[PDB]
Design a binder for this molecule. Sequence first.
Ligand SMILES: [Mg+2]
Ligand SMILES: [Mg+2]
Lengths: 106, 167, 127, 61, 122, 197
Amino acid sequence: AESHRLYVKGKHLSYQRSKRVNNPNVSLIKIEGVATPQDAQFYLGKRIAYVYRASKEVRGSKIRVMWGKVTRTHGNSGVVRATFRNNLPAKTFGASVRIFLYPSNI
Amino acid sequence: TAQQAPKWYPSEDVAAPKKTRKAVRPQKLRASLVPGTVLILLAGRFRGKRVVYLKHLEDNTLLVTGPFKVNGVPLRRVNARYVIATSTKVSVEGVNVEKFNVEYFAKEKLTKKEKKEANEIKTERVEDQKVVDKALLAEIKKTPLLKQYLSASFSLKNGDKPHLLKF
Amino acid sequence: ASLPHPKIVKKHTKKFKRHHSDRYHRVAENWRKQKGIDSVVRRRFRGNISQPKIGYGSNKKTKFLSPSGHKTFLVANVKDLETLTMHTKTYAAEIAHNISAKNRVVILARAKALGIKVTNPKGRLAL
Amino acid sequence: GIDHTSKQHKRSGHRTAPKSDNVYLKLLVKLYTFLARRTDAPFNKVVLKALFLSKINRPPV
Amino acid sequence: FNSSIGRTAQGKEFGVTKARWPAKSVKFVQGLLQNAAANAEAKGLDATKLYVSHIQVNQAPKQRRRTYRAHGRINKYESSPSHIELVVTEKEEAVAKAAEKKVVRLTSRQRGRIAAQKRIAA
Amino acid sequence: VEPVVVIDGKGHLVGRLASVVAKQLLNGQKIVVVRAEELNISGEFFRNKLKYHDFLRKATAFNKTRGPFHFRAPSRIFYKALRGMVSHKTARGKAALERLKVFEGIPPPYDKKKRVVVPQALRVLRLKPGRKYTTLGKLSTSVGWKYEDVVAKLEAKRKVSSAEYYAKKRAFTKKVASANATAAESDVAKQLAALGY
RNA sequence: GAAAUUGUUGAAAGGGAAGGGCAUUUGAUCAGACAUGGUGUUUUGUA
RNA sequence: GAAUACUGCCAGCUGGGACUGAGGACUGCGACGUAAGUCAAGGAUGCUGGCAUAAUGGUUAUAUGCCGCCCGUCUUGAAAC
RNA sequence: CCCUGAAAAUGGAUGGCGCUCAAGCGUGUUACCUAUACUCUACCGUCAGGGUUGAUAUGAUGCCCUGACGAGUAGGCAGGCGUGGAGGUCAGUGACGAAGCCUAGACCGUAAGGUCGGGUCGAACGGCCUCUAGUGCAGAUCUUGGUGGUAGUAGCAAAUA
RNA sequence: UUGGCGGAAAGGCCUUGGGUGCUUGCUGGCGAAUUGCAAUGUCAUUUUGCGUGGGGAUAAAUCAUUUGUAUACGACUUAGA
Ligand SMILES: [Mg+2]
Ligand SMILES: [Mg+2]
């Protein structure tokens, strides 16, 4: 067809933070479509990929991926907490990111 | 001397590990996976394609087929955590899937010397595929539009919420 | 070829540097504790440099081990090298910096015969 | 935080393993620490504690 | 070294405003340029492709004197001399080509994808 | 969900719209706000004129040129209210603010596009009926904006052209609705009705 | 033949200082493990 | 004559998610079993894939998010005009 | 509750933006955010309580088991790192290159520090057990010596040319 | 390709005619495997350079000289085949 998307779009909002101290080890993700923790409970444990590009070709590609997963819900509005192998570079606040449907329970 | 000595040397004998208590009970699959279910492949080379599930294998994998005449997916095994069990059900009674096992799919592992600088199929595999898919498509021809459904790919459109969608 | 060990963890892999060693050239970056009465580093304010303490200490099963998994032992000649004959999987030899090349070839030959690992088998070598 | 009712990390204040470097005295306290550990007689513990004592705590008899 | 010097129209060539005419420095530099051209023709160079490839100036030891200042004080009056060196070379052609081999590492999935593309197209 | 979101600023409250839009930019949504002369501020016109005069008094004493700049256009008033809610002095704030452009009227890049509203910042949904409000264009031309009438003339011309568009669109959709109704009650229509479409 | 301080070359950043801490992107640069004993001799210098 | 709400209990069942795997022959307390034995019972094992190299990682420069006032001294109190 | 009463000097502060059935005031119910605090786990150290001379191989100040604890100026104590020189030892290193110096190269230690590779260089130096002291610097309007910014700046204008 | 409309930042919208390709509106035939149980598994647009081969066009500014409606110096205003 014309669409081939097998993931859900999301936005990298910020790190986990207090009013004046942030914590880069936990990122905050807005998954689009979900507006409550009860709907966000479907997406727990799903893999997340941040997909970006670079000028230098490394192993056949100019596209590099950072992997992570959803761990828990955050707040009352469907924001989730996500942890990555290496933390997200904080210039990606507001950048798009992919939530895959695996590991599936359905 | 440059360094004097250590007064005691540590022993070089490696100890044995303790006797473990982790036996292997078999995998308890989720309830939506019954044989004959149409699955959607979430990842892999054939991602977004709808296949039919036949047999639960020994290494917790699912035996699936396209059929190969419909969408070009051969006889294959997939992971149960990388599929979506749709509610669409066909009957796979009349297919002899006990031939396939974990030794049926062997990669014939490659040596470190054989490096592909720049750049085939088992005849047993191809007539096994031809035996099973002609038994599947006879069950496919009963209810309408299943051949078209299995040939078409799955993809998420704008406005599709997977937490609200029923498959 | 080393003895099996747990995963080596460093609690603080960054070097502890003296406060204002970046600021003044007369202040070397070898660690000194701030004994001042108004020192933010001594008072441990947020956003300042961390200080060495006993909580950063390495695991006793992991301490003094190279990433290869051996402990470095300095050697000067063949008789010093021969002390590690029965302890090859725990210690690795390192030729001292002041050994000449015509002795270094002898120590490397004897270590290769005895199966001893040398951590610097490239010093003063001509090619 | 703990509301400590005592001084933390304090030594017991009783001298063990005597401050002398006499090797024969160290052999004697080795023998009597074996005897005090395993003979379950109070005499061995008493003489083991008396072996640690300093000179002014060992007056001549 | 240009703070509080005068401004001039002849810096428009170089996009600056502050420019001067250091006659003594020009005399010394052009004497060294003449000597280097003489060394080049003695060595047997082309004498038409020469460009000044290297030049540097750094400080010689100072030469001192003293200043007589008010209320009977002495100050210094020091000359700051120069060490100058320069190298003229012939302008050659393009330097080099034929860079590194850049050996590639591909996974089995990448190799299967490239083989699939090579099969699926011509 | 959208590449660019075009917001019709008419009938909106300035602070509530700015707090919606600033969070949208910080999340990464591109926003363009049109018709900035029709924003509303709660309160009397005299109260908001006094507020702007209190703001207009504030300037740097030794040099007025480096003081706070008192911008007079309604779009720049909205930009001031939004820059107050974005941390504009950082690189993240600058990158957020470059995803925004605010206009008086609807310029020709955006007069053929779709305009949306924000229902949690709409005056008729937020204020109690009876409370008094202002129009940002009236306040701005009271404090020194020069282009209130040329925007009105351009908006009149644009509305005439848009009504000419809408008459043709309405005629076409009535033809399409007539054909859909006559092509309904067939077998595919009843099967789609059973399946929910 | 050190440092302060300086010249040239190279790399990098720079909207009213610079420098630092935690974390990661990007660029540059770099260490370690990769044999192992092994059924085995498909063997040459026959062990 | 019932139901339901509210509160409380179950040595009732069961689904999803995250972090951790310390220890290193055996010894103990137990459970299921007539028994042999088995087990979730004094701390993780089983199966599989890719790569085997700057890929992970270390160092260093830069960028970004948040934080970070100049040290020493006297002083009740120092970033101190 | 709101309003009058209610006047100060650079421009100005519920922290700012702004907010009017509030994003104000009174009150109630839930959900949610996060401290170096609490719970569990790992690791480091300290303290305490214990086990273990049996043969083989070492270290009994050793090895092992268990539990609790960890802020700190003035100050006290303990264990260590480094320097000049001395007794002993390694029949130590070295003109096939000692010492020193440079090195956004590598390794070890929580740290003081130690080790290696490369460059430069040219004649002595080191590990361990002990002994000894003119033994560790950022400051003292410290001492001696050297060098900056200021800065190609102030200026080089009395006595007719 | 024909005809319009659009100046707020028009740079886009509509329309006439023919060509050409596809059509999943409906019914068929062949292909796909081996990427081995997943690895973004690579499909976008931004700028520049260098080659082709096809058009298009053949300037000024500054320094120096000069002016004094200007001027500390720069700058400004003039003149000069
Ligand atoms: Mg320094
Ligand atoms: Mg004078």
